Amino acid sequence: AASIDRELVPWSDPEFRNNPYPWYRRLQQDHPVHKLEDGTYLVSRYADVSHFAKLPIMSVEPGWADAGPWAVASDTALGSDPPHHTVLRRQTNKWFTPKLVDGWVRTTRELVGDLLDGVEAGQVIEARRDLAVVPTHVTMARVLQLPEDDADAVMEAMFEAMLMQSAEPADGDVDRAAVAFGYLSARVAEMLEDKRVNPGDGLADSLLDAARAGEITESEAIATILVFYAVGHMAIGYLIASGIELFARRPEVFTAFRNDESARAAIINEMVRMDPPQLSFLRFPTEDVEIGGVLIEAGSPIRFMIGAANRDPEVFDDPDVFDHTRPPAASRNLSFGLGPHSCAGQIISRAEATTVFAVLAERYERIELAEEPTVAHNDFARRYRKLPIVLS
Numbered sequence: 001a002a003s004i005d006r007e008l009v010p011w012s013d014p015e016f017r018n019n020p021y022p023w024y025r026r027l028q029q030d031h032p033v034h035k036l037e038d039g040t041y042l043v044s045r046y047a048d049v050s051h052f053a054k055l056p057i058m059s060v061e062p063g064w065a066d067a068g069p070w071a072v073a074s075d076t077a078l079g080s081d082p083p084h085h086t087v088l089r090r091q092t093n094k095w096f097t098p099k100l101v102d103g104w105v106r107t108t109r110e111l112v113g114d115l116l117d118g119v120e121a122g123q124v125i126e127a128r129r130d131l132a133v134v135p136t137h138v139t140m141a142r143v144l145q146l147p148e149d150d151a152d153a154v155m156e157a158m159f160e161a162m163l164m165q166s167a168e169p170a171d172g173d174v175d176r177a178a179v180a181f182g183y184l185s186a187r188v189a190e191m192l193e194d195k196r197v198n199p200g201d202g203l204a205d206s207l208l209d210a211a212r213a214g215e216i217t218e219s220e221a222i223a224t225i226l227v228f229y230a231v232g233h234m235a236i237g238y239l240i241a242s243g244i245e246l247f248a249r250r251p252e253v254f255t256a257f258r259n260d261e262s263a264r265a266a267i268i269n270e271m272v273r274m275d276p277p278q279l280s281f282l283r284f285p286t287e288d289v290e291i292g293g294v295l296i297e298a299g300s301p302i303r304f305m306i307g308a309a310n311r312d313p314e315v316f317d318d319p320d321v322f323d324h325t326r327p328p329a330a331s332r333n334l335s336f337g338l339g340p341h342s343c344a345g346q347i348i349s350r351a352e353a354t355t356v357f358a359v360l361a362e363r364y365e366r367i368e369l370a371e372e373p374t375v376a377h378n379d380f381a382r383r384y385r386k387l388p389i390v391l392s
């Protein structure tokens with residue numbers, strides 16, 4: 001009964017957390033629309049995720065009903081369906097046009113440079129903190145115009161907060177998320193009181209101006225500021241780390257990234273395809289909908305399996321192999337999601353990854369692992385703890 005669920009997707013199994021893709025291979029071929037004992041439908045075919053996930057009947061709002069500690073993020077873009085979604089989303093889009101982005105990642109460039117300047121031949125660099133988390137965190141903090149010194153505490157807070165996004169939380173996880181979020185709310189409250197008294201001209205000032213003007217509410221401003229401030233480092237952090245590891249295991253790819261500027265975007269997009277940091281998302285249909293022959297009742301949670309779908313053989317040949325010379329079309333992945341809740345940090349993310357890899361490219365020819373990486377993945381979200389590298 002609930003043992004067919006455990007055969008197919010054992011959410012807590014350590015090996016499944018390390019590498020689910022072999023479970024996904026079977027989920028997608030044999031049970032591409034699967035009803036779970038608790039009532040959640042898993043949709044795992046690409047054509048299916050692509051067509052159905054963006055339909056206007058797919059609401060985000062019930063996902064936030066008993067959010068607990070996550071209630072603090074609910075007055076942001078991901079907690080609203082259109083038409084109110086558009087009003088929020090627009091407030092951050094106008095800060096990440098591609099020209100503005102080129103500006104923001106200068107910060108990322110400086111910082112990776114300052115760090116490599118202080119390294120000696122053969123010195124083991126801990127890539128996760130020093131090339132992924134701090135640079136991206138500080139970059140976003142400077143866009144917002146907020147203090148930039150708390151990367152380490154912001155990351156552990158969000159590590160803890162994310163555990164309750166698992167389909168199978170452990171006893172205690174909701175409680176760890178209360179600790180984390182109450183920490184992030186207090187720090188944001190503190191920085192914003194300092195900002196009310198001494199305004200800047202950053203994205204936080206823009207959202208606060210917007211609330212004083214009535215374009216959004218005070219609460220949407222505060223919450224939108226907190227989400228960006230706290231996730232500035234997070235899934236993009238994972239991506240940069242993942243790319244660094246792949247460069248080390250497949251050095252010809254790093255070489256290709258060094259020597260061919262026009263291949264870079266495609267190299268990054270293949271890294272994104274093959275190792276998405278958020279492995280799924282939930283939507284709740286406002287009316288009955290039929291997918292893959294199964295009728296899904298209005299209100300049922302649907303879980304769209306991004307990771308599963310990025311390996312769909314009816315779209316990508318030899319899906320488990322890294323190949324950056326795929327055509328453009330049979331190289332669209334779902335890692336940044338789709339439809340109106342398509343990632344509001346997609347443009348800056350791609351640029352930050354490009355930039356960090358660029359600075360590495362400019363100075364070194366080889367990346368190597370000093371030890372096996374240390375990971376802390378779950379069934380919803382992937383994570384590195386430590387990625388020790390030697391550059392040469």
Ligand code: HEM
Nearest residue numbers: 077078089232235236278281335336337341343344345349
């Ligand atoms: C660079 C910092 C990032 C920020 C500030 C950011 C921010 C956000 C925000 C604000 C949303 C909700 C958008 C809306 O509902 O209108 C979102 C959605 C999402 N982001 Fe990001 N993101 C970042 C990096 C990434 C990266 C690198 C990935 C994936 C590789 C990613 C994956 C996603 C996914 C899958 C969604 C959609 C989830 C859903 O629809 O339920 N994010 N992001």
